[PDB]
A paper describes a structure:
Cyclic dimeric guanosine monophosphate (c-di-[name]) serves as a bacterial second messenger that modulates various processes including biofilm formation, motility, and host-microbe symbiosis. Here, we show that iron regulates c-di-[name] levels in [name] by modulating the interaction between an iron-sensing protein, [name], and a diguanylate cyclase, ImcA. Binding of iron to the [name] domain of [name] inhibits the [name]-ImcA interaction, which leads to increased c-di-[name] synthesis by ImcA, thus promoting biofilm formation and reducing bacterial motility. Our prediction results reflected that ImcA contains six membrane-spanning domains and a GGDEF domain while [name] is a multi-domain protein comprised of several domains including the PASPAC (IsmP273-413), GGDEF (IsmP413-585), EAL (IsmP585-865), and [name] (IsmP59-220) domains.
We solved the crystal structure of CHASE4IsmP at 1.9 Å resolution with P22121 symmetry. Each [name] domain contains two discontinuous subdomains: the membrane-distal subdomain and the membrane-proximal subdomain connected by a loop. The former exhibits an alpha+beta fold pattern, which contains a core five-stranded β-sheet, with other helices distributed on both sides of β-sheet; the latter mainly contains a three-stranded β-sheet, which is connected with the former through short α8 helix. The dimeric form is maintained by a pseudo-symmetric interface mainly consisting of several polar bonds mediated by Q51, W55, K96, 97 N, T180, D182, W212 and P247 from either chain in a dimer. In addition, the sidechain of N107 interacted with the Q69 from the other monomer via a hydrogen bond. Furthermore, the native-PAGE and SEC results indicated that [name] domain exists as a dimeric form in solvent. The isothermal titration calorimetric (ITC) analysis showed that [name] efficiently bound to trivalent Fe3+ with an approximate Kd of 7 μM but it did not bind to Mn2+, Mg2+ and Fe2+. Due to advances of computational biology, a putative Fe3+-bound [name] rough model could be established based on in silico analysis. Clearly, at least three amino acids, including E65, N66, and Q69 may play a key role in the Fe3+ binding to [name] according to this model. ITC assays demonstrated stronger binding affinity of IsmPCHASE4 towards Fe3+, however, the IsmPCHASE4 mutants exhibited weaker, even no binding affinity with Fe3+, suggesting the critical role of E65, N66, Q69 in Fe3+ sensing and ultimately binding.
Numbering used by the authors:
A (entry chain A), B (entry chain B): 36 to 249
The structure:
């Protein structure tokens, strides 16, 4: 036997808490990537949101409309292409504010990455500063299903879902994963709290280290 | 202060393991409930599946087709109404086997429960024995969105999604939540393993007692 390594119970609790905050975020992102490909790998979406955007089909007829906010919690829903933002829904209402104006991240990178990932039937996800708030962004190319003739993914439009990590959403997420008082770290010092970075943003999530799930 | 209560470290680990398995299941169920209403609260779905089921639209045109299995992992996708099963897709292929023949649970109960929940814009979920295997079932009424004229939900058809808890899905779910060797309990005794019941089924989930995550 090499011998055991005994650990401080607080160190174990802190390690578990970081593990479960990371898993909460990863699981949220993977669920949202699946949601995005559900809405974007869809022949109807390719017809009505590829090329010219039919806001009547998307918003008035509720095919990509306010429910995505009032039920699914996507504070931002966008269709973008090489010219920029072609459709914008902010908090369930039509908006003229472009995705690029709302984000710290480069939207051309989002467009290109979503186009490439669509080759593997995949979406992309990342963290962003959405108008000064932490958010998870997911994006996937708008393409028809396999019964349709093939298209060139290099020119496909891209659907974007922006999930702002509000105090209420963070508190529910923390409860979902047994984390005590998950919140956006206010100042620059965590002090008594543990914290992690939402990489690609200046935001950090912080929480009180207690025995998680107890 | 009342004074502290010190606990056995293995007892804490066991309590945390039960907490995170229960959260793993609840979060999976809530996600599938959202997925179900994404597909069922949909005017096109009401048109092509609400009464007579158009399998060309659903399967050939991939609006409710094989991707729901090959990407989203739903081993069973059904449309049911007062007459029984109107549409059945098993492992991504059209099937003649009814939902009622596949379940231990009563499908009239599912129809009624979903038709009611739709009044509150909700789906329903439960655990089932799906042809001898543990599964999560979710169901929601097929109804158009609010721009459409009102319909009678009491006569609406119901979409049903069946997520079979295969060994691969269970191992991945367990890893998602820091659980060691999550599996379908083989025999009748867990012995050294922890277990919980999938209520409404004879199935139990079992796992090896470890410090979760860590």
């Amino acid at each position: 036997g090499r011998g055991s390594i005994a650990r401080h119970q607080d160190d174990i609790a802190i390690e578990q808490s970081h593990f479960y905050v990371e898993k909460a975020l990863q699981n949220r992102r993977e669920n949202s990537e699946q949601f995005s490909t559900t809405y974007s790998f869809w022949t109807d979406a390719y017809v009505y949101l590829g090329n010219r955007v039919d806001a009547d089909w998307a918003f008035t007829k509720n095919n990509l409309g306010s429910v995505l906010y009032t039920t699914n919690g996507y504070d931002g829903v966008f269709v973008i292409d090489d010219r920029g933002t072609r459709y914008a829904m902010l908090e369930g209402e039509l908006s003229e504010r472009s995705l690029a104006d709302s984000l710290n991240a480069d939207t051309g990178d989002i467009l290109r990455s979503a186009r490439r990932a669509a080759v593997d039937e995949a979406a992309i996800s990342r963290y962003v500063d959405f108008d000064g708030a932490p958010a998870i962004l997911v994006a996937s190319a708008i393409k028809p299903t396999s019964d349709h003739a093939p298209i060139d993914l290099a020119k496909a439009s891209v659907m974007v879902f922006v999930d702002r990590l509000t105090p209420a959403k963070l508190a529910k997420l923390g409860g979902d994963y047994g984390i005590a008082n998950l919140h956006l770290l206010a100042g620059g010092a965590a002090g008594d709290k543990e914290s992690l970075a939402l990489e690609g943003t200046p935001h950090r999530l912080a929480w009180v280290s207690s025995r998680p799930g107890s």
